[PDB]
């Protein structure tokens, strides 16, 4: 579904109407009369195999390769763990500076693209969002120090979705790693953290 008004062609995703609002003189009613929200539409830059910096998270400045545009809008990303240390991670387009560089423009790696695409497809949106039960379990540990952390980690590991994600990541690594390693400079780049320095002015940097 899409609407094409004044030449845009906007694309409509069906949304749910969660919030109830108090009606004027009798009882409650759902706020959103609207049923179909316009889709995010990512910028003409975010591709399927570009390296991108992750600006914001714990993995701050690590350059990771983009994996899947995730329907929801925010996209998946991997620093094929065993290369970089960034796992299969979901991230918004905004907390990424996608570079001009592309993995699938190197002559060696470009031929492994179909498999990568397939792997990406295998990933879903709901496989990231942690279920309530797990969260509850995690919380339950708060009634020593390092022990607690360990327990939390264990709990995280336990989740089936998480396990699946891990497996996927591993598969991706297997697919990708050796070629990347062989292109030594590129591998190094992937490993390294992007930093601003005096001289790197930022507004002039076409990266």
């Amino acid at each position: 579904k899409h609407y094409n008004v004044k030449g845009k062609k906007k694309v409509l995703v069906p949304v749910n109407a969660k919030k109830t609002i108090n009606k004027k003189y009798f009882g409650r009613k759902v706020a959103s009369k609207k049923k179909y929200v316009v889709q995010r539409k990512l910028r003409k830059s975010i591709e399927v195999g570009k390296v991108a910096i992750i600006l914001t998270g714990k993995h701050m400045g690590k350059r990771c390769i983009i994996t899947k545009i995730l329907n929801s809008g925010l996209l998946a990303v991997v620093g094929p763990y065993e290369i970089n240390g960034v796992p299969l991670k979901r991230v918004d387009s905004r907390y990424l500076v996608v570079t001009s560089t592309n993995i699938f423009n190197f002559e060696n790696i470009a031929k492994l693209k179909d498999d990568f695409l397939n792997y990406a497809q295998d990933i879903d949106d709901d496989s990231f969002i942690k279920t309530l039960e797990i969260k509850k379990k995690q919380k339950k540990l708060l009634k020593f120090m390092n022990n607690v952390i360990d327990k939390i980690k264990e709990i995280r590991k336990e989740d089936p979705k998480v396990q699946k994600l891990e497996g996927i990541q591993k598969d991706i690594g297997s697919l990708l790693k050796p070629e990347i390693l062989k292109n030594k400079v590129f591998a190094h780049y992937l490993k390294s953290k992007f930093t601003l320095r005096n001289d790197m002015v930022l507004h002039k940097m076409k990266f």
Binding site: K58, Q138, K139, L142, V148, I149, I152
Partner: protein, 170 residues
């Protein structure tokens, strides 16, 4: 008494009802005393009555002189208010007696609260000038003295953040 005490078993009180001494001088004396061991305070008072150590007049210091003794308290001005000291000495003695009556060793007693309030003034007349009567009031004071024997929330996200920070530091 104006203090907060908790255990009055370790305290020894003492008061003067309406002392016919100047509030200002006696206030100064009290200030000089306060937070002293009782015996030391007593000693000091005795010295001042025999004009050996001054009491430094820091607050009510209009016109008060410029003694050599005031150097001891990092100050220029001081006096040797005798009458005030005597009154104060009496009340210290009373306090000591009270302590004795209790089971408080007077060596370990600190003046925790030396309060001097001004009391209701006695009124007299002085005669001035072109047939004008003026007041010639005393400024008496109440003295209260108290000697006293002397010798969370974690959160999961927050925890995670902390751990991450620690890791980064490492």
């Amino acid at each position: 008494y104006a203090k907060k005490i908790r255990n009055l078993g370790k305290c020894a009180k003492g008061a003067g009802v309406d002392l016919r001494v100047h509030f200002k001088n006696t206030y100064e004396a009290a200030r000089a005393i306060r937070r002293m061991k009782l015996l030391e305070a007593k000693k000091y008072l005795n010295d001042v009555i025999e004009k050996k150590r001054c009491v430094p007049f820091r607050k009510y210091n209009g016109g008060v002189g410029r003694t050599n003794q005031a150097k001891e308290f990092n100050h220029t001005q001081g006096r040797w208010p005798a009458k005030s000291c005597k009154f104060l000495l009496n009340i210290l003695d009373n306090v000591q007696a009270n302590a004795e009556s209790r089971n408080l060793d007077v060596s370990k007693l600190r003046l925790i609260h030396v309060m001097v309030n001004k009391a209701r003034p006695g009124r007299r007349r002085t005669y001035k000038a072109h047939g004008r009567i003026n007041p010639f009031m005393s400024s008496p004071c109440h003295i209260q003295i108290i000697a006293r024997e002397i010798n969370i929330s974690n959160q999961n996200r927050l925890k995670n953040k902390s751990v991450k920070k620690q890791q980064t530091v490492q």
